[PDB]
Design a protein around this ligand. Structure first.
Ligand SMILES: [Cl-]
Length: 413
């Protein structure tokens, strides 16, 4: 175009937007992608703080492992000791001398944070609660939680007791991966618990019948309140909600289940030493993130600040396979010193580069080979010659770096 001056200089290249460093007033947090393990946001992620009921995640972790290993099943009926039934704090209200299934006890532990249920599972798997705590600390070392020490199975304060946001994210990621069925329990909205029979009722079964409960005692007054029901569906309301049976009704106190779209976990906790804490996970279009927030001064901030982290990660990041393993990258070998002029050099790594990167970076990433600057011929097949490098645009800034190995031979002159 001869009727415009300086169009090439007037044209505006798109400006790459880096994700801004998020700011919360939580003393510690971490946000991690599930499939890559990459950390996209964190503060003080290795500072040791009190665990509170996040301890119950490890207890639930060990319960799932014993089920997967065949030493336990969801159907197994555990006796409730008087020690378990009488533990204070959050209860699911299991009675001493009763038998309760693993499925019910795990639901009480995960959804209601019941200490009596946690203690009942611990006594059964470990014998004593002390022995079970030792198993918790061994399992923590095996997962790689190197800054974590539990004093008991339920997170009640007392004794040496700590974890980190990074360690809790490692535990959660392992939980999602190894125990997907047990992890589904954390998405339960609440627990409808028949304390008389010592068994639960599906929340869906409650919404069908809509029973009437005495406000002051939890005793069922009416089995069904629905105006029109089938005679046989009416009797199933009468069997699941008898007349006079005592019921306890509790919601899952992870508010994110109700407010955050795609949130399916995980666990809350609160002591004076730990503050309000939340391990949470949200999935949106195949992309799952894990967030841990520790030490907030209120439950509302605990939920507010966790949602900010999950929304920030889910909307600004992306999983990309930057390098497919065993992919050749060939270049001319003439420039490398002491090399014969005829030959070429191919390099490759047996590893992938699968990384969580900002969405805004993706169209600007470039594969590059950074050779050892002192590389001269001869070089043998299987010799390490440098790194495969992912850079951002035409700059030298590196997003990923992986050592690369020689697939050819070069002969010196
Ligand atoms: Cl993911």
């Amino acid at each position: 175009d001869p009727y415009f001056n300086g169009a090439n200089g007037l044209a505006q290249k798109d400006i790459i937007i880096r994700p801004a460093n998020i700011e919360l007033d939580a003393p510690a947090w971490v946000t991690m992608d599930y499939r890559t393990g990459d950390i996209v946001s964190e503060k003080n992620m290795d500072v040791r703080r009190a665990p509170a009921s996040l301890t119950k995640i490890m207890t639930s972790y060990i319960v799932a492992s014993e089920i997967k290993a065949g030493n336990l099943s969801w159907d197994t009926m555990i006796p409730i000791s008087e020690n378990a039934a009488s533990t204070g704090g959050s209860k699911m209200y299991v009675k001493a001398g009763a038998k309760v299934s693993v499925r019910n006890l795990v639901t009480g532990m995960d959804v209601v944070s019941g200490n009596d249920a946690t203690i009942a599972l611990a006594e059964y798997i470990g014998g004593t609660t002390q022995a079970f705590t030792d198993l918790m600390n061994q399992t923590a070392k095996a997962i790689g939680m190197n800054n974590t020490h539990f004093a008991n199975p339920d997170g009640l304060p007392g004794g040496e007791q700590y974890t980190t946001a990074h360690d809790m994210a490692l535990l959660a990621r392992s939980y999602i991966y190894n125990f997907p069925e047990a992890y589904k329990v954390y998405d339960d909205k609440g627990l409808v618990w028949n304390a008389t029979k010592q068994d639960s009722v599906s929340i869906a079964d409650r919404k069908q019948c809509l029973p009437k409960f005495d406000r002051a005692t939890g005793n069922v007054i009416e089995s069904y309140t629905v105006k029109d029901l089938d005679d046989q569906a009416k009797d199933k309301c009468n069997k699941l909600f008898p007349k006079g049976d005592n019921f306890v009704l509790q919601n899952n106190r992870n508010r994110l289940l109700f407010t955050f779209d795609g949130a399916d976990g995980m666990k809350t906790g609160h002591t004076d030493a730990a503050g309000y804490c939340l391990v949470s996970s949200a999935k949106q279009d195949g992309e799952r993130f894990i967030s841990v927030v520790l030490g907030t001064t209120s439950s509302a901030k605990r939920d507010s600040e966790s949602a900010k982290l999950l929304r920030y990660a889910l909307s600004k990041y992306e999983n990309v396979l930057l390098y497919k393993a065993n992919s050749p990258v060939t270049i001319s070998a003439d420039n490398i010193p002491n090399a014969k002029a005829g030959q070429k050099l191919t390099v490759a790594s047996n590893q992938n580069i699968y990384k969580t990167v900002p969405k805004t970076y993706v169209p600007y990433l470039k594969q590059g080979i950074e050779f050892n600057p002192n590389l001269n011929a001869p070089i043998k097949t299987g010799q390490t010659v440098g790194n495969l490098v992912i850079t951002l645009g035409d700059t030298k800034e590196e997003i990923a770096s992986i050592p690369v190995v020689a697939m050819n031979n070069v002969s010196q002159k």
